[PDB]
Amino acid sequence: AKVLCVLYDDPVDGYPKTYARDDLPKIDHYPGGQTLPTPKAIDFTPGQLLGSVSGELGLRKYLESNGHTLVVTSDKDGPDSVFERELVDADVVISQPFWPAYLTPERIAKAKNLKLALTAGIGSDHVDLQSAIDRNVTVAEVTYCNSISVAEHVVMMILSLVRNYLPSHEWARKGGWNIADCVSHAYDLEAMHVGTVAAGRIGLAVLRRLAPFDVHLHYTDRHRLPESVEKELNLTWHATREDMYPVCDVVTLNIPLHPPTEHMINDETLKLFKRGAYIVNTARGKLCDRDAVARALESGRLAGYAGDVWFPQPAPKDHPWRTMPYNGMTPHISGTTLTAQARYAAGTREILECFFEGRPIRDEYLIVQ
Amino acid sequence: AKVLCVLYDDPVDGYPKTYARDDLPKIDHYPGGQTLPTPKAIDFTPGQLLGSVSGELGLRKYLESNGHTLVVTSDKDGPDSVFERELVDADVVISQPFWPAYLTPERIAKAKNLKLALTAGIGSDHVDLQSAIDRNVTVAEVTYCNSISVAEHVVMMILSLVRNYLPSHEWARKGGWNIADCVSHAYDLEAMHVGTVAAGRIGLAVLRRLAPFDVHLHYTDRHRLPESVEKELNLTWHATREDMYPVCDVVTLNIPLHPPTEHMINDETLKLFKRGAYIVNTARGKLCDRDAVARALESGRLAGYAGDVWFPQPAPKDHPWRTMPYNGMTPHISGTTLTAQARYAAGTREILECFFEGRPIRDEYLIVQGGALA
Predict the structure, then answer these.
(1) Mutation target vs B (from A28, A184, A234, A282; most B CBs, 10 A cutoff)
(2) Best residue in B50, B282, B337 for a mutation probing chain A (most A CBs within 10 Å)
(3) A14 touches chain B (CB under 8 A)
(4) Is residue B28 exposed (0-12), middle (13-18) or buried (19+ Cβ within 10 Å)?
(5) Where are the domains of chain B?
(6) How crowded is residue B295: how many other Cβ atoms within 10 Å of its Cβ?
(7) Which residues 285-314 in chain A show a CB within 8 A of chain B?
(8) Which of A249, A252, B141, B281 is deepest in the core (most CB within 10 A)?
């Protein structure tokens, strides 16, 4: 079989030769009991850079020793890309949401041999699901592989925005001291009201991490959490997002993007936020009207905005979120720490082993089959 | 009476005329039950910049309307400085640990009228306690006023070092994307081993905040915490610092500075650390040998270092911790957020009211009174 694997570029200084640490913490399961991936074997050392082109998700030696071909590329966009040319006879397509190889209906139509569309990561927004089903393409993901990674990123950003960490660090880096300049925009997080717009795997993990900071926790969702969880975390539930915003000092968005949520944060709804509110958004960039957020930070409606998701993605060099006041942006990276990469590289191998050996892929990995 | 109050400078663009928010969250007590300050009144709006010279800790109207004198200055060092000149007849001296007016034995000797040395903040590191005892000077602090503020700072820095936040943010700020450059030094915190070198008010608050990140918690201290605390946080106890280091992915220092802890982190003890360990230090800069930390980050013995305390302080412009690899430094600010300032400005007034009215100052505020009776 032919495996076509799209990954992002190596570091500018080249694929790393050394790493900061020698191993990764051992984890038995995810919250709720799902076990971590169980491939028969791995050809990588957990902690290596696996999601760049030279990392190959540690797949080459398993595939080639079993008679398969592996084509790795970062050239994924447009009809002229390496991905599009190799797609026509690829049996398996693999990519990460952090550098996604889109499986449009047009591409699925030309992918005459396509049997498996594998997300090395979470989700399937880059895959046209009905076209995949109609063509008997299996679509699978490494469920839960980086939900905790994103939640850590969220809480880190909440703390950094509220305490004015990033300008403070710049004063130190540039040789200043400037105590009053650091803290004239700096507060404690303690006893603030924090709300999450969804409470799935990420949102729940965020709520649990926020609780011992003694904040007042709010959330909105379609499904209320179990009453025992609301009670142990002292949660206030809101039926609508609009009912939650006016009471929150901090709002974190952990909800999927669809037309009814596209630009749900705009000039009109920002009017509902407390003056000086903070927003953290690691879900999707298009949840926020780009220029409305920037306008809210210029006026002081918001006291900070941070996240790792942008529209468009990758963000152009001139994207205004890069330089607007009191931003805590990073590039799209939260779920591709070396820790998360080890999990979803192992999960990718587990799925491939099942697929090639004719054994069932985990139910929780399957999206459509 | 004459009150001499040393504060840090206003922002370079001037004292702020607006603030990012309109009020502060309400908090009833500190962990363990100590109530927040209870002055009879305050002449400031909580959230204002109170620890700079123009903020005056909100004290001027209260002191002057009661016949007192108030001198506020940031000019605190040297024989011609405002502080040294006004010290000779001051009844009360107030300063913050973030810009401390040192009360050495020599200065206390020259302060002919000194009756009260008030820390607008926590501690008394800048005050010679024996001189205060010998001269019957009361020494007081606004206990607990920013212990939580520092703990937040610590966990924020732990997350930022582990996940490589600060270089990642700059790739974004500078117009890049560079996913692999961001994450080739980036990990999750989950299930790492984190140890604190003391577990007092700050260290315990750090442990509680770290627990739901599903890390493995370690600590050492002079005495063990109550078993009920160890169990609820699943703590591993270590009798010595040296026994704790080799097992920790992250070590946070929350211990006071004394001769036995000076340079406790050095080229020799760093050999005990896991390769790629992270250190966060909001206690005092001289706990860590300056160049040993820088050497450990160049070699990879440490994968990151962050904190807000430096040696010396203020850090000179060329201080190597400012630019060494994988640092998360800030200036000395963790316990002077606007939130903490409201608490210790209120606490400062409460103590002053008691002192001038001849009412007892809270036992928990007292460091010295006649003798070292906290």
Answers:
(1) A184
(2) B337
(3) no
(4) exposed
(5) 1-145+336-374, 146-335
(6) 16
(7) 300, 303, 314
(8) A252
**What secondary structure does DSSP assign to B42-93, as a single string?**
-SS-TTS--SBTTTGGG-HHHHHHTT-EEEEES--SSTTSHHHHHGGG-SEE
How many angstroms is the resolution? 2.1
Question: A146-335 belongs to which homologous superfamily?
Answer: NAD(P)-binding Rossmann-like Domain (3.40.50.720)
Structure-token match 């206690």, residue found: B283
- How far is A348 from B300, CA to CA, in rounded Å? 31
What fold characterizes domain B1-145+336-374?
A: Rossmann fold (3.40.50)
Q: Closest by alpha carbon to A71, among A80, B318, A84?
A: A84
> What CATH homologous superfamily does A1-145+336-369 map to?
NAD(P)-binding Rossmann-like Domain (3.40.50.720)
Whether the domain at B1-145+336-374 and the domain at B146-335 fall into the same CATH topology: yes
A74 burial type by CB count under 10 A (0-12 exposed, 13-18 middle, 19+ buried) = middle
The identity of residue A50, as a single letter, is: L
Name the experimental technique.
X-ray
| CB burial string B201-232: b at 16+ within 10 A, e below | bbbbbbbbbbbbbbbbbbbbbeeebeeeebee
Query: Phi and psi (nearest 5°) for A118?
Result: -110, 125
